[PDB]
Amino acid sequence: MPMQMFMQVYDEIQMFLLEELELKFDMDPNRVRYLRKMMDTTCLGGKYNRGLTVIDVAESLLSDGARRKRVLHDACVCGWMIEFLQAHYLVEDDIMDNSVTRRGKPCWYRHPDVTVQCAINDGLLLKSWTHMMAMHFFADRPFLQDLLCRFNRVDYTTAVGQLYDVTSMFDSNKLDPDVSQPTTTDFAEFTLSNYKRIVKYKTAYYTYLLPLVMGLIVSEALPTVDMGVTEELAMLMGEYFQVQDDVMDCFTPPERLGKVGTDIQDAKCSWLAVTFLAKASSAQVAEFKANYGSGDSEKVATVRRLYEEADLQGDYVAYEAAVAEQVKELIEKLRLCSPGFAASVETLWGKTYKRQK
């Protein structure tokens, strides 16, 4: 039922925004139709993990009848805030990554009647909607300020991780806006240390810490959990989640994934890249430097081939195990003083551990 009560609030939100545009920004039906379409296409079709997580946390920590109602509603609004937030970032990211499809559909900036210049702004509109909806729905909620403050923080950190991502293939020593530079040749920066930094900031926060946090804020139970642990967890699961993202972008068929991979082509500092490099021989690495970051598909097949022949699947399974170990412990360590939360966190994990997509 949460999925349907969530979609229910979506209509509620879409109605407000769209009608507000027609009534106070004197927008035309044509463009109202466009934004409705834009909204549904960029915000729907995902796994809704972030949004559904918020609702779960809220529900779980429920401890009147009108309250439960209000709370669950507030959760739905927050969920869409995060959902609208990822929407804003996927739009821009696909433009930044030159991706082809998203959620079994052409990337927004790829749709025929959508131009790149407009997609960039359509993305901007998404980010404003996160505020417009929070303000309108939480105008009276005392937790409004704190909520937005945290939201912008996470948003800001994600934009920082993105910077790390989109520049990992450039020797930072030479990184000078005034002087042009080619993709790194030595890859001397493709380290797990550097990899851990990208992932932590570009994904962990908004994908894991934020949904959890927003649930505690709307349930007004924030001060009841061991944040220090809760974050450790979020940082951990987030890293994992992103490592999966990387692996699928290389080995999970789009028909299944919903998106065509671009890392190898984009010369990204992925999990596969840093792991391979750290364990590969000079011969293997020379070949890598000869086929990585190339659109040419037979070269991508070379890279893909190289990874398989270095047993990355072994490293992966090993990593995934070490993670499951710590996650298990931290959740218990958390369950002690926060049974309900620990439970929702454990749930969020179920949606994570060995996901297919």
Ligand X SMILES: CC(C)CCOP(=O)(O)OP(=O)(O)O
Q: Any contact of residue 31 with its own copies (CB under 8 A)?
A: yes
Min dist CB 201 to ligand NI9, Å, is 9
**From the list 87, 230, 245, 344, which residue makes contact with ligand NI9 (rule: CB under 6 A)?**
245
- Partner touching 203 among ligand NI9, its own copies, Mg ion, none, CB below 5 to 8 Å by kind: ligand NI9
Stretch that binds its own copies, among 54-62, 112-120, 240-248, 285-293 (CB under 8 A): 112-120
Q: Select the span of 153-161, 282-290, 302-310, 318-326 touching its own copies (CB under 8 A).
A: 153-161
Residue 160, binding choice from its own copies, Mg ion, ligand X, none, Cβ under 5 to 8 Å by partner class: its own copies
The contacts of residue 291 (CB under 8 Å, 6+ apart) are: 299, 300, 302, 303, 306
CA nearest neighbour of 319 among 208, 220, 199, 219: 199
| Residue 199 or 285 with smaller CB distance to ligand NI9 | 199
Report the b/e string of 93-105 with b at 16+ CB within 10 A.
bbbebebeebbee
Query: Which residues 6+ apart lie within 8 Å of 38 measured at CB?
Result: 108, 122, 125
| CA nearest neighbour of 330 among 302, 349, 311, 303 | 349
Known binder of ligand: residue 140? no
Residue 219 interacts with ligand X (CB under 6 A): yes or no: no
Structure tokens at 308: 């398989």
Residues from 28 through 67 that contact ligand X (CB under 6 A): 46-47, 49
Among 41, 49, 203, 230, binds ligand NI9 (CB under 6 A): 203
Q: How does DSSP classify residue 176?
A: B
**Distance in angstroms between the alpha carbons of the first and the last residue of the chain:** 21
By a kind-dependent CB cut-off of 5 to 8 A, residue 46 interacts, out of ligand NI9, ligand X, Mg ion, none, with ligand X
DSSP state letter for 178: T
Task: Please choose which of ligand X, ligand NI9, Mg ion, none residue 168 contacts, taking the beta carbon within 5 to 8 angstroms, the exact cut-off set by kind.
Answer: none
Which residue, 39 or 57, is less far from its own copies as judged by CB? 39
226 is in an annotated binding site: no
Nearest-CA neighbor of 55 among 86, 16, 82? Answer: 82
Contact 208, 352 (CB under 8 A): no
Residue 106's beta-bridge partner residues?
A: 101
Q: Where are the alpha helices (DSSP H) in 98-222?
A: 116-138, 144-165, 192-199, 210-218
11 has binding-site annotation: no
Provide the phi-psi class of 97: left if phi over 0, else alpha when psi is between -120 and 50, else beta: alpha
Consult the annotation and say whether 94 binds a ligand: yes
> Token digits for 127?
């980010």
Distance (Å) of CA 357 to CA 97, 204, 284, 294: 20, 18, 31, 26
Residue nearest to ligand NI9 (CB): 89
Instruction: Say if residue 165 carries a ligand binding annotation.
Output: yes
Which one of 41, 157, 242, 291 is in contact with ligand X (CB under 6 A)? 242
Q: Which of 3, 44, 62, 175 binds its own copies (CB under 8 A)?
A: 175
Task: Write the interaction track for ligand NI9 spanning residues 136-175; mark x where CB under 6 A is met and - where it is not.
Answer: ----------------------x---x--x----------
When asked if residue 44 is in the footprint of its own copies (CB under 8 A), the reply is: no
The residues binding its own copies (CB under 8 A) are 21, 25-28, 30-31, 33-35, 37-38, 41, 92, 95-98, 108, 111-118, 120-122, 124-125, 127-128, 131-132, 135, 144-145, 148-149, 152-153, 155-157, 159-160, 162-164, 166-167, 170, 172-181, 197, 200-201
